[PDB]
Amino acid sequence: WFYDHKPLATTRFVNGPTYRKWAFSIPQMSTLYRLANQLLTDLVDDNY
Amino acid sequence: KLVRFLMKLSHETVNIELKNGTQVSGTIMGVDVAMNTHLRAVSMTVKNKEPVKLDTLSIRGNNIRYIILPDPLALDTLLI
Amino acid sequence: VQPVNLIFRYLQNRTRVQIWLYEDVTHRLEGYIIGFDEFMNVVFDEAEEVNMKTKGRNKIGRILLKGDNITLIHAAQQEA
Amino acid sequence: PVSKKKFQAAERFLPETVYKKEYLADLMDCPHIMRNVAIAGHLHHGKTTFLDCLMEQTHPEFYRAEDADARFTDILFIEKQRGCSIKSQPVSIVAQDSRSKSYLLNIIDTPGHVNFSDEMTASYRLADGVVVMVDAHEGVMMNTERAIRHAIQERLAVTLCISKIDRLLLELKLPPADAYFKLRLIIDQVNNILSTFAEEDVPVLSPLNGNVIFSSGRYNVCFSLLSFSNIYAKQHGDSFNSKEFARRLWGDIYFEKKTRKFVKKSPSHDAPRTFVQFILEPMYKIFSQVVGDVDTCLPDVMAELGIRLSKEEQKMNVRPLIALICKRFFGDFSAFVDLVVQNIKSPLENAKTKIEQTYLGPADSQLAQEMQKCNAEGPLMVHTTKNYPVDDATQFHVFGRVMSGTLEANTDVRVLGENYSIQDEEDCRRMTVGRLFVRVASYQIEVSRVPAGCWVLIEGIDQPIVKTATIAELGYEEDVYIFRPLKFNTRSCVKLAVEPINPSELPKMLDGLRKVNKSYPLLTTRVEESGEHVLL
Amino acid sequence: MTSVGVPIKILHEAEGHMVTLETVTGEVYRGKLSEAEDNMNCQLAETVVTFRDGRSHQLDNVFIRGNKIRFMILPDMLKNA
Amino acid sequence: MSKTHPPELKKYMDKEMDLKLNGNRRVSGILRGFDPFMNMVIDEAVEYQKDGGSVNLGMTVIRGNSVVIMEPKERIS
Amino acid sequence: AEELAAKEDEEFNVGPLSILTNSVKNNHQVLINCRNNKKLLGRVKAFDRHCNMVLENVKEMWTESVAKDRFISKMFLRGDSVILVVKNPLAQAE
Amino acid sequence: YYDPLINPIVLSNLKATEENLPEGEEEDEWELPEDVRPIFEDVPLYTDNTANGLALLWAPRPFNLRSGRTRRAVDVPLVKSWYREHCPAGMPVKVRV
Amino acid sequence: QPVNPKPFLNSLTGKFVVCKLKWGMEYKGVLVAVDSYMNLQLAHAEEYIDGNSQGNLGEILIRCNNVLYVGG
Amino acid sequence: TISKNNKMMAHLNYRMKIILQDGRTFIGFFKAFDKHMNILLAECEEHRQIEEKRILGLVLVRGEHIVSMTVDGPPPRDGGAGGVGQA
Numbered sequence A: 001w002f003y004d005h006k007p008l009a010t011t012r013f014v015n016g017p018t019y020r021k022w023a024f025s026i027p028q029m030s031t032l033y034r035l036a037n038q039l040l041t042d043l044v045d046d047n048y
Numbered sequence B: 001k002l003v004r005f006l007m008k009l010s011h012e013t014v015n016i017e018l019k020n021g022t023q024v025s026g027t028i029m030g031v032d033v034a035m036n037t038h039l040r041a042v043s044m045t046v047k048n049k050e051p052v053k054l055d056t057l058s059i060r061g062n063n064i065r066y067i068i069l070p071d072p073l074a075l076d077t078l079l080i
Numbered sequence C: 001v002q003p004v005n006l007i008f009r010y011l012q013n014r015t016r017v018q019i020w021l022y023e024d025v026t027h028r029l030e031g032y033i034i035g036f037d038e039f040m041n042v043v044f045d046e047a048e049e050v051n052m053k054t055k056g057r058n059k060i061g062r063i064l065l066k067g068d069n070i071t072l073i074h075a076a077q078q079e080a
Numbered sequence D: 001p002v003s004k005k006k007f008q009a010a011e012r013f014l015p016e017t018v019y020k021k022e023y024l025a026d027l028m029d030c031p032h033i034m035r036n037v038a039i040a041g042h043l044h045h046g047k048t049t050f051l052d053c054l055m056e057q058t059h060p061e062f063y064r065a066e067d068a069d070a071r072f073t074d075i076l077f078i079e080k081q082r083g084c085s086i087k088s089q090p091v092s093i094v095a096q097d098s099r100s101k102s103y104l105l106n107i108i109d110t111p112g113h114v115n116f117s118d119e120m121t122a123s124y125r126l127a128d129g130v131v132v133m134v135d136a137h138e139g140v141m142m143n144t145e146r147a148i149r150h151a152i153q154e155r156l157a158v159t160l161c162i163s164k165i166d167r168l169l170l171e172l173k174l175p176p177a178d179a180y181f182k183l184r185l186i187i188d189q190v191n192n193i194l195s196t197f198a199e200e201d202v203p204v205l206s207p208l209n210g211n212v213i214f215s216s217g218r219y220n221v222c223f224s225l226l227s228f229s230n231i232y233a234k235q236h237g238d239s240f241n242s243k244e245f246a247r248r249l250w251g252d253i254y255f256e257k258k259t260r261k262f263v264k265k266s267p268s269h270d271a272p273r274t275f276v277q278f279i280l281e282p283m284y285k286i287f288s289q290v291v292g293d294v295d296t297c298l299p300d301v302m303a304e305l306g307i308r309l310s311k312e313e314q315k316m317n318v319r320p321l322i323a324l325i326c327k328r329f330f331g332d333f334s335a336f337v338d339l340v341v342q343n344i345k346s347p348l349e350n351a352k353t354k355i356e357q358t359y360l361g362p363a364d365s366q367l368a369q370e371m372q373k374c375n376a377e378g379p380l381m382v383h384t385t386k387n388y389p390v391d392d393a394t395q396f397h398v399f400g401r402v403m404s405g406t407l408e409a410n411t412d413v414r415v416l417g418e419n420y421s422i423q424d425e426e427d428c429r430r431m432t433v434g435r436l437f438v439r440v441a442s443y444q445i446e447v448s449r450v451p452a453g454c455w456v457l458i459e460g461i462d463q464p465i466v467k468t469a470t471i472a473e474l475g476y477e478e479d480v481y482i483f484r485p486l487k488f489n490t491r492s493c494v495k496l497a498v499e500p501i502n503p504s505e506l507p508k509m510l511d512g513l514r515k516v517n518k519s520y521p522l523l524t525t526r527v528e529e530s531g532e533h534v535l536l
Numbered sequence E: 001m002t003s004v005g006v007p008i009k010i011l012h013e014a015e016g017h018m019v020t021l022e023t024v025t026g027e028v029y030r031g032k033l034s035e036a037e038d039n040m041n042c043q044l045a046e047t048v049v050t051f052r053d054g055r056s057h058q059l060d061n062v063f064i065r066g067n068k069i070r071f072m073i074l075p076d077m078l079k080n081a
Numbered sequence F: 001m002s003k004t005h006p007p008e009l010k011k012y013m014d015k016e017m018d019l020k021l022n023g024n025r026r027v028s029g030i031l032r033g034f035d036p037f038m039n040m041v042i043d044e045a046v047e048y049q050k051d052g053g054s055v056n057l058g059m060t061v062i063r064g065n066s067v068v069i070m071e072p073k074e075r076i077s
Numbered sequence G: 001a002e003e004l005a006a007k008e009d010e011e012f013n014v015g016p017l018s019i020l021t022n023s024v025k026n027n028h029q030v031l032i033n034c035r036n037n038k039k040l041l042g043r044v045k046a047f048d049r050h051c052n053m054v055l056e057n058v059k060e061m062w063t064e065s066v067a068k069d070r071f072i073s074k075m076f077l078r079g080d081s082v083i084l085v086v087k088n089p090l091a092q093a094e
Numbered sequence H: 001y002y003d004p005l006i007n008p009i010v011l012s013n014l015k016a017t018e019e020n021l022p023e024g025e026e027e028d029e030w031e032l033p034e035d036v037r038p039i040f041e042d043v044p045l046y047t048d049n050t051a052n053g054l055a056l057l058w059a060p061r062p063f064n065l066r067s068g069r070t071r072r073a074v075d076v077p078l079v080k081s082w083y084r085e086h087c088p089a090g091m092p093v094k095v096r097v
Numbered sequence I: 001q002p003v004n005p006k007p008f009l010n011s012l013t014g015k016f017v018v019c020k021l022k023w024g025m026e027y028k029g030v031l032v033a034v035d036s037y038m039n040l041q042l043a044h045a046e047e048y049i050d051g052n053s054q055g056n057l058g059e060i061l062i063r064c065n066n067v068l069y070v071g072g
Numbered sequence J: 001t002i003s004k005n006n007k008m009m010a011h012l013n014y015r016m017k018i019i020l021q022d023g024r025t026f027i028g029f030f031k032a033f034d035k036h037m038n039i040l041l042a043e044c045e046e047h048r049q050i051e052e053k054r055i056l057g058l059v060l061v062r063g064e065h066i067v068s069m070t071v072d073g074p075p076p077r078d079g080g081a082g083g084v085g086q087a
């Protein structure tokens, strides 16, 4: 589903076609956290 | 167990003799698993005292000595 | 020390003990314990029913005194 | 004219509470059933966020954000912004122990920064004991050791909360066995401090002694060995004596499943201790499931714990879900109230100890003999240690502990400053008391009388009270002495001169300096002979 | 704990207050309820005993067995707990 | 059929206890044992008679439900 | 709820309660002595472990002393009052 | 697992606290009933997802969230984390400005 | 050597016993049966008051609570 | 009525007159009970024949001693809301 227009919009993971809420699992979120890594900060806390 | 006979009686009219000698007459509106008995339209004749008239009365079940059952009662059908 | 262990001392020693009865202030049983159960029932041996107000002594050769009636059990002394 | 100069949180209404307010007010008459408790520790070791849980339990409408600390007792806006507690705030609540008997808990939250340890002194003067928060990660730090030592010097009952235990699970990821050693070492470090005080025996802290508790304010966790044993007792029909299980849930005891008996030598190479087996591993599994397996484990968590989670509660984020799961399983922090009730003395029991330490008058003066009875019918004495600005900063309310008698609203009292003596009686005033309140941080429950042993916030007497004061009965005939000044834990080294930019506005600055001097217990304002105005 | 009826819970909140209780033999004991139990055994500190003839004594402590208590008078404020 | 929890007599142990029993007997001595029924053990027990006489009972067990009032002569431990 | 109300009836085939068992099914009158120092004579038609009974066609007699008596068509007796049950020799199987 | 960057839990000179364990013959015989069992005994302490879940908790937002509201595509500023933090040590003046 | 109540009453089953009730009447008879709650059933049982018989009752069931003691 | 759990409260907060086995009559607002039929009476008083009155307070009666109880008096006492229009 990664490259659909409104991915998961019809599934249980998001409320419906109005596309207002989402609720993922940890396999989903961790795969996504990996794919984003080129854009993300390495910082673990605000103290920096 | 025979307490589960008495609570099949409801709306029956009885005379209840409490252990204290109080005679209570009235209509059973419900009696529980401890035979705590709840009567309505009740008259307490406390021993050596004039009968009062009462609307309702809850008797803690251990005070019951015996209940005179209503004479027409179909004991054959309730003792099953 | 616990009560049940103490009764075992009387049982093992076969100590003559005097039992106080519940509510009955007027009689006490003197004898030897030979066994008991969790309900404080005492199999009692050579039991003598002391009648303290007369100091009379009836004798009752071995009884099960029901534990429900026991108030106190103490070692009987050399006096009579 | 609409100068919205607000500088602290203020509540338009009383919040709802589980207890009726009248039950709180009526419990004030019974000093057997109340405790005056400081909460202390290092900076950010979880003190305020722990009080947030007690607030949430006692106030049904109290809101905790899913991702920021409420910090109810950080009522000042600078405390909101700085993110640290700067001034101590009291909170009086009724809370039930494990017996489900209500106790009135008087609790001063205190700041954990070293600099503001003058606020810790002002709070220890009102308390009968202290609960020390020690971060399960950091362990004993500088101001932890200072807070323990200062409590023993002030003769407070020291008790221990090992806070932020989730940081072992979630940040350090120590195996449950190595978590037990980390917790144990914190207890050992604390008892190493107490054993320096050879001259006055301080009871040894251990969870076996019922005076240590473990907690995580973020995730609504707080337990002692007994509250976990009661969870097993509840869950398994009370088929065992929970006191005897609690007594075996710490130390080098191992459980043996073959024999159902508990043994003091390891039955295998890797046998978990009873703490590791029955307390830590279930806590790890409460977390690791919802951390790794939020999408699948939630029915099993519900089935095991006997918990309901709605459709939308099951869609919560990991942090607020674990906090909600723990809130519904462990329930209210009876383990804290046990620590307080059983290990901290009542104001009545601590009365003798408190007068020895804090009262300058002879210990066998009749007035001292009365205050040691903590007698609500005795002569009025009140010791106030802390001044709090009213919401417009025009004036201060003074916060304190009635030591004897009953303080009454709209009555006259003799107020004595720190300089009063039987020789130099000039530091004495008659003031009329305004309203009286039970302060509960951001809001105040007004009361007409406060009996001995309680804490009270007092309107109208603040003008002569520079820092601490003694308020005494006017009628009282024998020599009234004061309570001694605070003996602070530190000094004011940092010297900082001030000067108005307009010399025609110097009177306004001097009024400011009088006010901040009332606010900060250890702030000294001088005028130097050079004419500089100096804050230390 | 496991659930127990409100009268026993209120009795545990009567701890630390003054109470008065009458025993089945008729004596009235007034004191400060230092402990209660789920069987309503009671320990009274600071006790005053009143006999049915109206005489009295102070007693430093009393333990009264629960099934020998006829009734208690609790304090008033417990109606708010 | 019920579940019985030990009485909190633990603080009274080994202090001299007075007792009043059914029938208004008074027994006095060193309490040093109890059970869930509060079946007492009184050591060195002494009966106090209805006339001011006294009798040494020695070591004694008392069935708990005969005990009415239980009352130190001396300070709790 | 009712499971232990139905399982109860096993022991009554042989225990001391058998005098009630025979009193019901063979219809022997029993002279139930009670507390209050009163005698009830009647045919038990049910009983239980607690020794409740329902009595048909009862004669109650006591001394009040002069003898007095009362006739009760049907009764339920709470078993805690039952001292002593006797198969009355002044009656028989019916 | 005990990562070797975590210092060992030891201090060289602390007295071990007194463990007041129950003792004596009557007390070693105390047994827990046969059904009482740790509150998640059959659940494994960790799954293959547990290490990843522990990683997400400290992830940059949104990845420390498993649920939330959607956002507009225009709202999500993909690069904003990059210039919020200090400029890397080698970037030209053109870039630093 | 212990002689517990149940073995004792079992050894008396089918033998003559005296049973005394808490309220002073005594019943002498053959103890035909006992149960695990210590009710007593006697046969040929006869009631004695002040040491005097007042006649044969026949078979009796003494409910468990009434018994003061029972013995040979 | 009472303790039938759908109607557990059936006489709660009524003023009730309680007769004990010693013949005493207590009167008060019956506002809690227990499975042992313990009862808690607020604002309780006792009454005896001559009628002699005494005030007690909040009385807890151990259930073992209760003979019976009766309704003596009612509980104490004190088109909804909304709206859209104007007039």
Ligand SMILES: Nc1nc2c(ncn2[C@@H]2O[C@H](COP(=O)(O)OP(=O)(O)OP(=O)(O)O)[C@@H](O)[C@H]2O)c(=O)[nH]1
Pocket: D042, D043, D044, D045, D046, D047, D048, D049, D050, D069, D071, D083, D084, D085, D086, D110, D111, D112, D113, D163, D164, D165, D166, D167, D215, D216, D217, D218, D219
């Ligand atoms: N991991 C974890 N962090 C917590 C917990 N409780 C509080 N914190 C965090 O620790 C920090 C400090 O919490 P505070 O409640 O402000 O602690 P505090 O001691 O009152 O701070 P000061 O009073 O100013 O010393 C905040 O960032 C909280 O989010 C906890 O239980 N677990």
Ligand SMILES: [Mg+2]
Pocket: D047, D048, D049, D084, D085, D109, D110, D111, D112
């Ligand atoms: Mg704080």
